[PDB]
Amino acid sequence: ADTRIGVTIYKYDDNFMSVVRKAIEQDAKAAPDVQLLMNDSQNDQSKQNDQIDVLLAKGVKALAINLVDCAAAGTVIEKARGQNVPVVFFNKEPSRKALDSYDKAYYVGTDSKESGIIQGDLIAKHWAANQGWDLNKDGQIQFVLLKGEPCHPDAEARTTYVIKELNDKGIKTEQLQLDTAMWDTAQAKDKMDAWLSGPNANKIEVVIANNDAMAMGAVEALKAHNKSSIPVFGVDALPEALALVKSGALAGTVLNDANNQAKATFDLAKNLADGKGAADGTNWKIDNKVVRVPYVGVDKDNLAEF
Ligand SMILES: OC[C@H]1O[C@@H](O)[C@H](O)[C@@H](O)[C@@H]1O
Numbered sequence: 001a002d003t004r005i006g007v008t009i010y011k012y013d014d015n016f017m018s019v020v021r022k023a024i025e026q027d028a029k030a031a032p033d034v035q036l037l038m039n040d041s042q043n044d045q046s047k048q049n050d051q052i053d054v055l056l057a058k059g060v061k062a063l064a065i066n067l068v069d070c071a072a073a074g075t076v077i078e079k080a081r082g083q084n085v086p087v088v089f090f091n092k093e094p095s096r097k098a099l100d101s102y103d104k105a106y107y108v109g110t111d112s113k114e115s116g117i118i119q120g121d122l123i124a125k126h127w128a129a130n131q132g133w134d135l136n137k138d139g140q141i142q143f144v145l146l147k148g149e150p151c152h153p154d155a156e157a158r159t160t161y162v163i164k165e166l167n168d169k170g171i172k173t174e175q176l177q178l179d180t181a182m183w184d185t186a187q188a189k190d191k192m193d194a195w196l197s198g199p200n201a202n203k204i205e206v207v208i209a210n211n212d213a214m215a216m217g218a219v220e221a222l223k224a225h226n227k228s229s230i231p232v233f234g235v236d237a238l239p240e241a242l243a244l245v246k247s248g249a250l251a252g253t254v255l256n257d258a259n260n261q262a263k264a265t266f267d268l269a270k271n272l273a274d275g276k277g278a279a280d281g282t283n284w285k286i287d288n289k290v291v292r293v294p295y296v297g298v299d300k301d302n303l304a305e306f
């Protein structure tokens with residue numbers, strides 16, 4: 001009797017997707033006529049592909065798919081199409097072409113560039129309020145940047161737009177180091193430690209991370225080098241990160257609204273499973289099959305709101 005919805009999470013121990021997956025499990029458990037079949041793809045698209053085959057064998061009436069491979073939507077769509085099963089992609093955004101190739105494909109996520117713009121504005125505000133951060137007193141921000149996984153739309157947009165926004169405001173920037181840490185805390189700690197062991201160590205004025213997990217790794221490397229005075233900025237507003245905004249270990253972040261992305265994903269998947277319009281009975285705004293949930297800047301000054 002219960003409507004089965006298959007869900008794949010690209011990697012369960014991704015800090016942000018852990019918040020999302022626990023929220024969507026809660027949403028489903030609050031709803032009686034639904035059974036969620038949850039899968040950890042263990043950061044391997046081949047594993048996810050096999051999981052989708054199994055979910056289809058089990059007759060799920062909708063799929064909610066958080067891709068491993070940024071470009072794998074077409075592969076997933078062709079599996080789903082064979083059984084007329086709708087697919088709500090979430091958090092890793094397929095191409096416009098992929099979404100348009102299947103009348104039952106949808107996406108729930110964010111306007112990726114917005115998070116870069118907000119982060120840049122946040123840095124600009126704090127830079128202006130903390131001119132002691134300009135260690136070499138040249139009027140430019142000497143920064144290092146910890147990038148997410150290449151090709152992930154959030155990594156690409158946050159990396160491009162944080163710097164564009166600063167520069168557009170009239171703040172010149174100098175990139176001292178930039179590398180991916182693949183969204184991961186331990187990789188970011190190791191990378192930041194390398195940078196703090198290299199010739200630019202002393203010159204680094206601001207650490208910019210594409211997410212909070214990498215920001216937290218940087219914070220722990222700075223602590224080990226007795227350089228916690230160097231500001232670090234993140235994205236996601238993870239609970240662990242907000243505690244660092246409060247303690248002063250993290251200068252700022254940006255809410256990536258996991259609870260509403262989870263709810264929208266669930267709501268659309270359940271409507272589609274039921275053969276209804278994707279947004280029926282909800283306030284979600286679907287624009288060409290996409291729901292985007294706003295980001296919100298967070299620092300000590302507005303922390304009491306969160
Ligand atoms: O796809 C996973 C990534 O999604 C991004 O939107 C989040 O900001 C990251 O923390 C996360 O690692």
Ligand SMILES: [Ca+2]
Pocket residue numbers: 134135136137138139140141142205
């Ligand atoms: Ca400077």
